[PDB]
RNA sequence: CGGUAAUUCCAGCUCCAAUAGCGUAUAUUAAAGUUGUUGCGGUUAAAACGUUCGUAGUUGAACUUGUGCUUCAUAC
RNA sequence: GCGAUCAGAUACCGCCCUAGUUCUAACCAUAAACGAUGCCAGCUAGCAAUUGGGUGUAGCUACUUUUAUGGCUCUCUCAGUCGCUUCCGGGAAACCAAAGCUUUUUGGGCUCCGGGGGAAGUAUGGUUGCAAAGCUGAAACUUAAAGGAAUUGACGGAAGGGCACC
């Protein structure tokens, strides 16, 4: 609320999980320690800055992810979010619904004399 | 012949509510629709628009590199069709935020100069065509009856409002670009299923898993 | 009121190609006007023009090829002798190269260079380019 | 010394640095959007010299108490058939005079030269009567025969000599002492010389080449090819 | 333009609109040279030899981009049976 | 220094038309160019509504409201924050907006 | 511009101008498309009688003998 | 005339009535009498309302009965008038569908009518009014600017939103 995450603690945060979400958890006091390995902070109060916020979003990472960040671990399942749902096709296989003024357009443009039933 | 309408596909256009047209006419948009029903149903000449798929098809081919054709949809109901549309043609799927202007780039040595343009929606994407209008771009599009037809060549009206309409219109174009020097082997049935440009369920997508596997424990 | 039946017919031709009207619905079929549209076709300025005749006045349809810039009219018919036709070139034309003012003398309706060979002084109706 | 070997932003300058475009008209058929000044210095630089028009000042009003800014009208142009105009604000003159002149290279127009009354020997002045109306400044161009130089105001003669005309009766109406629309309108006046249909141009064309398609092979390769 | 001794003297000849006969201005950056191509009449099989056209932006500003090429395709018989 | 396009209100093919005075200033102004708020305001101001239900002879009598079309002039609108001060462009709509709640002062 | 460190004043200095001519004032045309038909302006920058009829004014539709037909001088 | 208020109020606020608004008979005839834009002919773009009149319902609804006259809805239509859209027109701009087509040193007709301020809508006469006053209208003198829209300084007691015991 009263303390706002600044640009340095936010815009630098968008890659460090994106590069190293693997082998990183929500446990803060060890993720506090991990900042020295992947990064170099000048001062540990900025480690007290940048590590608390990224641990204040790991459940929000896990549940209801918000734009601006990419996980790269759920990115491959989006191709299986590109799933065929069997078996969607034509609804009643023709379909027989016709507006009875495009029914002549089914007859005059198309030579298809296939089944069309009018519903008012 | 085969370059004629192939009327079995028009049976799927009735599934895609392509006969329905929007009510404001925009007098430059007149020729493709035929009649208006009472209680607000405009009825379009569906035999016309299939040849306008062809005129769209006859223009998009005979361009050697398939990269510098850019497919556009800002509305998220159209983004579902177009990013999977680029799985077969080699276009760049740019759907949603177009970040104007695209005209002094930051990290890419290949400048964001489009060459050819396809767009789903003419109305909400009135800005990126205006982006492209500065730099001499043909803007092929789908459309509806109520549309500012400025700088649009060409415009394909079917329904342009429902996911069952818009996802299937990309399926027909993927035939004709592969029917015309794209080794589909002469207008035969797709190897793939022809409805993958679709919302499986509206967002947020309910947990229907991959390959339709059902839960054995509850 | 339709004051001059000549000039009003001319301007709607100029009020076609700006929004790109390739056709012109035009009124009211006077034989002085029929002596004028073929002069455009005598240098190929417009497309095909045709005239239906109702039994009041007749009316004209005009197709256009799109090569025109502006057709104009001096009003009314100023009397011009031979020795002073050259004054009406430079004030009305872009240059001596192209363009044609059109007057009519006692021999008929013609081009000015046609009149510069026919040599008979007459009255200006209009001009074009 | 360049001092920098020019990089192409877009593929258009990539095409001219590859040497596959050797014609300044090649962009001029389809009005190609030239948004790098290096292509102007690729084909030209020879006979492409510059002259400043004014260095006139402006002011920006602030909280306390003023803000002074500069503004310099300038015009580069090839000595036969081309000209460019432009201007740009700057908080210092040397930031303007070395930077504002870049803009006019994006405004290089082919100037069509014409005869007046006789079709012999390398047309000189102007095709037809063309006016440039821009902001109470209507420079009307009237073709002239030989001997008679470019008559104008005392100011725009340096534009028209570095464009390529020799003979023209020319004026305008209004406050030319408000110079800001005056040199700008001539830039729009002389540009319209290819916006007039001529019966000399009534035969058309082989209808097009589009060097995108004619040079897509170099476009398709992702290799940074030299030469 | 052309001299007495038959030469394209000036610099070049700028383009002209195929559809509605206008000029193509040197800075009019909304003019398109689009190149539509042919079909083998049996089934697909695009051949070479294509149909380029010139459309001016003044037509493209009014919104008559689309059906203007519908005139030329029927005038060239490419899109037929309409 | 013309800002409105048509000007005030509703002077199409008439000339000069009916006035009635404002209530809170009575600068006598024509009926078109004066701000015309219309309100069905309630009687108890939504606070004694729970008290009259106990003191009612019948089952709550259910309470009516008042109806009177009031008429305001321009400074009356601005000296009570009725309608004020859009942009040079945001003066170009009439029909929208409220968008949030069933409007109070009725209520 | 001159109100105490003067690029305009008074001198000297050099520089320039046109040159046997320079200057003054005064009317006149051009510049001035700021007396205008060509050649502007009238929403507001100076500006449509509040009004409608209404003669003198002034301007007025269309329609009122020809393309041809054959030949030659004649381009080719 | 009187009370306040104020330094003063001869005013902004109150109280009283007086000319008069009233309708009949006339008499001036001017207003920012404004859409600060004269009138008639033509073309050029939509979109949406709505007035009347037509017309088509291959419309419902009304019951006098399914009807009928009648209502609404849709369709078409002329006179439009409003509004909105974007020149792709035009302007110095706000704004404009005509203020556009007066661009190319341009032309659809006809009338008045302006040439910097202030002198000044004052004098001088005529003309008209029962009058208060109008159609009418200058000059020596004096002046280098008066204004046209727009940008910026006013989150300079002016609107809307948020801050410290300067």
Curated annotation (Swiss-Prot), chain A:
The gene is RpS17. GO terms for molecular function: structural constituent of ribosome. GO terms for cellular component: cytosolic ribosome; cytosolic small ribosomal subunit. PANTHER family: 40S RIBOSOMAL PROTEIN S17. The keyword Ribosomal protein applies. SUPFAM superfamilies: Rps17e-like. It comes from the Eukaryota. PROSITE patterns: RIBOSOMAL_S17E. Keywords: Ribonucleoprotein, Ribosomal protein. This is Small ribosomal subunit protein eS17. Belongs to the eukaryotic ribosomal protein eS17 family. GO terms for biological process: cytoplasmic translation. The keyword Ribosomal protein applies. The lineage of its organism: Eukaryota, Metazoa, Ecdysozoa, Arthropoda, Hexapoda.
UniProtKB/Swiss-Prot annotation, chain B:
GO terms for biological process: cytoplasmic translation; ribosomal small subunit assembly. Keywords: Cytoplasm, Developmental protein, Nucleus, Ribonucleoprotein, Ribosomal protein. It is found in: Cytoplasm; Nucleus. GO terms for molecular function: ribosome binding; structural constituent of ribosome. Coiled coil: none annotated. Belongs to the universal ribosomal protein uS2 family. Required for the assembly and/or stability of the 40S ribosomal subunit. Required for the processing of the 20S rRNA-precursor to mature 18S rRNA in a late step of the maturation of 40S ribosomal subunits. Required during oogenesis and imaginal development. This is Small ribosomal subunit protein uS2. The lineage of its organism: Eukaryota, Metazoa, Ecdysozoa, Arthropoda, Hexapoda. The chain holds residues 6 to 223 of 270 of the full protein.
Curated annotation (Swiss-Prot), chain E:
The keyword Ribosomal protein applies. It is found in: Cytoplasm, Cytosol; Cytoplasm; Rough endoplasmic reticulum. Disulfide bonds: none annotated. The keyword Ribosomal protein applies. InterPro entries: Ribosomal_eS21 (IPR001931), Ribosomal_eS21_CS (IPR018279), Ribosomal_eS21_sf (IPR038579). GO terms for biological process: cytoplasmic translation; endonucleolytic cleavage in ITS1 to separate SSU-rRNA from 5.8S rRNA and LSU-rRNA from tricistronic rRNA transcript (SSU-rRNA, 5.8S rRNA, LSU-rRNA); endonucleolytic cleavage to generate mature 3'-end of SSU-rRNA from (SSU-rRNA, 5.8S rRNA, LSU-rRNA); lymph gland development; regulation of cell population proliferation; regulation of translation. One of its GO terms (molecular function) is ribosome binding. GO terms for cellular component: cytosolic ribosome; cytosolic small ribosomal subunit; ribosome; rough endoplasmic reticulum. Belongs to the eukaryotic ribosomal protein eS21 family. Component of the 40S small ribosomal subunit. Interacts with sta. This is Small ribosomal subunit protein eS21. The gene is RpS21.
Swiss-Prot record, chain F:
This is Small ribosomal subunit protein eS26. It is found in: Cytoplasm, Cytosol; Cytoplasm; Rough endoplasmic reticulum. Gene3D superfamilies: Ribosomal protein S26e. Component of the 40S small ribosomal subunit. Pfam families: Ribosomal_S26e. One of its GO terms (biological process) is cytoplasmic translation. Keywords: Cytoplasm, Endoplasmic reticulum, Ribonucleoprotein, Ribosomal protein. Residues 86-107 are annotated as: Disordered. GO terms for cellular component: cytoplasmic side of rough endoplasmic reticulum membrane; cytosolic ribosome; cytosolic small ribosomal subunit; ribosome. One of its GO terms (molecular function) is structural constituent of ribosome. It comes from the Eukaryota. The gene is RpS26. The lineage of its organism: Eukaryota, Metazoa, Ecdysozoa, Arthropoda, Hexapoda. Belongs to the eukaryotic ribosomal protein eS26 family.
